[PDB]
Structure 1
Amino acid sequence: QNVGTQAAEEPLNLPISVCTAPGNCQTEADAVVLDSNWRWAHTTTGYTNCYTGNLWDTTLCPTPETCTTNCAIDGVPLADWSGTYGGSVTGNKFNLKFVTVSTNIGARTFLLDSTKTRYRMFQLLNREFTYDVDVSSLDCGLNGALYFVSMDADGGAAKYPTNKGGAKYGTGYCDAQCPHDVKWINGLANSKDWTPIPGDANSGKGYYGNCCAELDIWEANKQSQAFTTHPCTPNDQTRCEGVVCGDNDSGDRYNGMCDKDGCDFASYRMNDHTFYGPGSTFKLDSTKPFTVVSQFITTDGTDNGDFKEFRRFYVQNGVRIENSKVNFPGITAYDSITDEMCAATKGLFGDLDDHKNKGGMKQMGEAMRKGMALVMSIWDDHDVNMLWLDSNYPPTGNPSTPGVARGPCPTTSGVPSEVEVTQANAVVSFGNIKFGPIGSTV
């Protein structure tokens, strides 16, 4: 995309901590940038929309190349962050409102480095990543997500010279779902064969998808939470078409370059229904804030080893809370993501181990070694109504069959039109982000 001249781009300042030992950290003066999908797209030498509602203008965008020549994405000024997009920062806390009323629904954002010209790339192997979260106002159907993806640090600017904005304009998004709803891919409008998504007034799908590796630290609302590894072959940003995208709609979910299911550790799905929930007698009380700690263990305990284990623990009101465990007869009580856990649990659930097909923890680790961009988002799910996270999936499945039940939400929950009314004022908060060696962040 070209860059428009109507509004300066002003990312929100967000300090994080880089740590060397427990309680010995230094501030890193980073910032938050809005994903290019949420930006106004208009004519390069005017005010005329190139995209309105869920459609590209066919006169301006008869082809992707012409669209890209004629159109530009514009900046987010400071005033518009809260007023239009529902984003705000107080000290080291970042807040994202779900619905902001001209009416904005959801948000996806990235962490910029201290220069505000590149994404802050995190080399996560043999490191610990930690943050405080509040998901108390997110119920069934919503997801306040924090995760990493194998985006380029410059959003693709060096690879795709028609991308003028780079990381500064939140470009280059890709993930392990190979999404077609990304409006700008490889520096070009994804306007070919663009199709609105029914019941989604703001979104559509273009000819291409954009694939890359994804490490989900946090997919969650107050009812259920998960962390998940998604390797791809290769891991780096890859525009896809046809079978390579692994499109759900053509029966290709397991035929593409990315592991779409991922290998998940989701406490409720692993059959501990009392670990996490909205109340003081759950082990971890989702009505109150808490700290989420993630440790990425290698084979030799060094930065050069292969990724072998994703460990997790929590801190809430000064109380250390170890992760829940897998709880099925004849299955080891795993409390972390490893290749063995993935094989054993997917075996039990009858899920295809595409994680293993894509190179497993080792391949996931190669993405983490090269460095990944931090994503913070809030969203509802127009495909599957978040049932995969917090309900029975498939909805018609027996909840006593291992793998089906992922949370207590009813199978009628999560319809975007309903959650966008009922949960309009939901806000996820991510704060006090800390990054360092294992054992350094609490």
Structure 2
Amino acid sequence: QNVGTQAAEEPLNLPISVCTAPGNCQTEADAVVLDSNWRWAHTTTGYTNCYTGNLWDTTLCPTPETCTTNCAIDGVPLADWSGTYGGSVTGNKFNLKFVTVSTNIGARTFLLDSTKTRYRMFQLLNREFTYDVDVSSLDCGLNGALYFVSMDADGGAAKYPTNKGGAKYGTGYCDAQCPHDVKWINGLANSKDWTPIPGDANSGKGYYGNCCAELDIWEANKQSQAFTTHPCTPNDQTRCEGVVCGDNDSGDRYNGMCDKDGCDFASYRMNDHTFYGPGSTFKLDSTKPFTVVSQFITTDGTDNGDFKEFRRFYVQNGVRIENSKVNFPGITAYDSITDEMCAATKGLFGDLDDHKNKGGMKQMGEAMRKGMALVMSIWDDHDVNMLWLDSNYPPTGNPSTPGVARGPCPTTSGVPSEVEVTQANAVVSFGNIKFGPIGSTV
């Protein structure tokens, strides 16, 4: 995309901590940038929309190349962050409102480095990543997500010279779902064969998808939470078409370059329904804030080893809370993501181990070694109504069959039109982000 001249781009300042030992950290003066999908797209030498509602203008965008020549994405000024997009920062806390009323629904954002010209790339192997979260106002059907993806640090600017904005304009998004709803891919409008998504007034799908590796630290609302590894072959940003995208709609979910299911550790799905929930007698009380700690263990305990284990623990009101465990007869009580856990649990659930097909923890680790961009988002799910996260999936499945039940939400929950009314004022908060060696962040 070209860059427009109507509004300066002003990312929100967000300090994080880089740590060397427990309680010995230094501030890193980073910032938050809005994903290019949420930006106004208009004519390069005017005010005329190139995209309105869920459609590209066919006169301006008869082809992707013409669209890209004629159109530009514009900046987010400071005033518009809260007023238009529902984003705000107080000290080291970042807040994202779900619906902001001209009416904005959801948000996806990235962490910029201290220069505000590149994404802050995190080399996560043999490191610990930690943050405080509040998901108390997110119920069934919503997801306040924090995760990493194998985006380029410059959003693709060096690879795709028609991308003028780079990381500064939140470009280059890709993930392990190979999404077609990304409006700008490889420096070009994804306007070919663009199709609105029914019941989604703001979104559509273009000819291409954009694939890359994804490490989900946090997919969650107050009812259920998960962390998940998604390797791809290769891991780096890859525009896809046809079978390579692994499109759900053509029966290709397991035929593409990315592991779409991922290998998940989701406490409720692993059959501990009392670990996490909205109340003081759950082990971890989702009505109150808490700290989420993630440790990425290698084979030799060094930065050069292969990724072998994703460990997790929590801190809430000064109380250390170890992760829940897998709880099925004849299955080891795993409390972390490893290749063995993935094989054993997917075996039990009858899920295809595409994680293993894509190179497993080792391949996931190669993405983490090269460095990944931090994503913070809030969203509802127009495909599957978040049932995969917090309900029975498939909805018609027996909840006593291992793998089906992922949370207590009813199978009628999560319809975007309903959650966008009922949960309009939901806000996820991510704060006090800390990064360092294992054992350094609490």
Q: Tell me which interval the TM-score lies in, with the shorter structure as reference length.
A: over 0.9
Give the secondary-structure state (helix, strand or coil) at the position aligned to 2:365: helix
* 1:348 CA drift (Å): 0.0
1-structure distance, mates of 2:59, 2:316: 55
* 1:190 CA drift (Å): 0.0
1-structure distance, mates of 2:287, 2:73: 38
Aligned residue in 2 for 1:290: 290
2-structure distance, mates of 1:262, 1:168: 29
- Residue-by-residue CA offset, 1:202-255 (whole Å, 9 max, x unaligned): 000000000000000000000000000000000000000000000000000000
2-structure distance, mates of 1:15, 1:121: 15
1-structure distance, mates of 2:251, 2:138: 32
* 1:133 CA drift (Å): 0.0
2-structure distance, mates of 1:219, 1:247: 21
Give the secondary-structure state (helix, strand or coil) at the position aligned to 1:361: helix
Give the secondary-structure state (helix, strand or coil) at the position aligned to 1:109: strand
Aligned residue in 2 for 1:379: 379
2-structure distance, mates of 1:340, 1:285: 30
- Runs of 4+, deviation exceeding 4 Å: none
1-structure distance, mates of 2:192, 2:89: 37
* 1:99 CA drift (Å): 0.0
1-structure distance, mates of 2:219, 2:22: 27
* 1:360 CA drift (Å): 0.0
* 1:433 CA drift (Å): 0.0
2-structure distance, mates of 1:381, 1:147: 17
- Residue-by-residue CA offset, 1:9-29 (whole Å, 9 max, x unaligned): 000000000000000000000
* 1:364 CA drift (Å): 0.0
* 1:67 CA drift (Å): 0.0
Aligned residue in 2 for 1:408: 408
* 1:192 CA drift (Å): 0.0
1-structure distance, mates of 2:66, 2:227: 41
2-structure distance, mates of 1:172, 1:156: 6
- Residue-by-residue CA offset, 1:157-210 (whole Å, 9 max, x unaligned): 000000000000000000000000000000000000000000000000000000
Give the secondary-structure state (helix, strand or coil) at the position aligned to 1:80: helix
- Residue-by-residue CA offset, 1:260-307 (whole Å, 9 max, x unaligned): 000000000000000000000000000000000000000000000000
2-structure distance, mates of 1:321, 1:140: 24
1-structure distance, mates of 2:366, 2:268: 29
* 1:73 CA drift (Å): 0.0
* 1:108 CA drift (Å): 0.0
Question: Which segments of 5 or more consecutive residues in structure 2 lack a partner in the other structure?
Answer: none
Give the secondary-structure state (helix, strand or coil) at the position aligned to 1:79: helix
2-structure distance, mates of 1:409, 1:172: 34
2:90 matched to 1:90? yes
- Map residues 77-226 of structure 1 onto 2, 5 A cutoff: 77-226=77-226
2-structure distance, mates of 1:8, 1:438: 39
Question: Which segments of 5 or more consecutive residues in structure 1 lack a partner in the other structure?
Answer: none
2-structure distance, mates of 1:78, 1:392: 41
* 1:69 CA drift (Å): 0.0
* 1:376 CA drift (Å): 0.0
Give the secondary-structure state (helix, strand or coil) at the position aligned to 2:32: strand
* 1:326 CA drift (Å): 0.0
2-structure distance, mates of 1:411, 1:441: 38
* 1:102 CA drift (Å): 0.0
Give the secondary-structure state (helix, strand or coil) at the position aligned to 1:95: strand
* 1:374 CA drift (Å): 0.0
Give the paired residue count. Answer: 442
2-structure distance, mates of 1:343, 1:126: 23
1-structure distance, mates of 2:176, 2:322: 28
- Residue-by-residue CA offset, 1:129-160 (whole Å, 9 max, x unaligned): 00000000000000000000000000000000
Root-mean-square deviation (CA, aligned residues, Å) is 0.0
Aligned residue in 1 for 2:231: 231
2-structure distance, mates of 1:413, 1:401: 20
* 1:104 CA drift (Å): 0.0
- Map residues 333-352 of structure 1 onto 2, 5 A cutoff: 333-352=333-352
* 1:72 CA drift (Å): 0.0
* 1:366 CA drift (Å): 0.0
2-structure distance, mates of 1:193, 1:387: 29
1-structure distance, mates of 2:226, 2:29: 29
- What percent of counterpart residues are identical? 100
